Amino acid sequence: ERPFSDILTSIRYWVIHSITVPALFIAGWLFVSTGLAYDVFGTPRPNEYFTEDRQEAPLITDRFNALEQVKKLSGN
């Protein structure tokens, strides 16, 4: 039953996947365009790479105290 070619040619597939598929594309568009992707993953925005303390690349350089150090490297 349903061998991958009566699904793609069925209209009930496209009365679902012309609504959920664009609303999921827009959900991915708004995850980044609202800046939330910069906050969840901690990637710096293009105005966040260099604070006034440092003008160089960060260096973690400390194992067990890295959690509060990367807060100081990022500038929070």
Binding site: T9, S10, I11, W14
Partner: protein
């Protein structure tokens, strides 16, 4: 089953797959990672 033709699905879905790929080459020359 057969309500829409499979070749018209594969044309249209293939077109905005080539169309989405052209956005990835458009965005490779402008904005982030454009070297300008």
């Amino acid at each position: 089953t057969g309500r829409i033709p499979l070749w018209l699905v594969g044309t249209v879905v293939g077109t905005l797959a080539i169309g989405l790929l052209a956005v990835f080459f458009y965005g490779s020359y402008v904005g982030l990672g454009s070297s300008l």
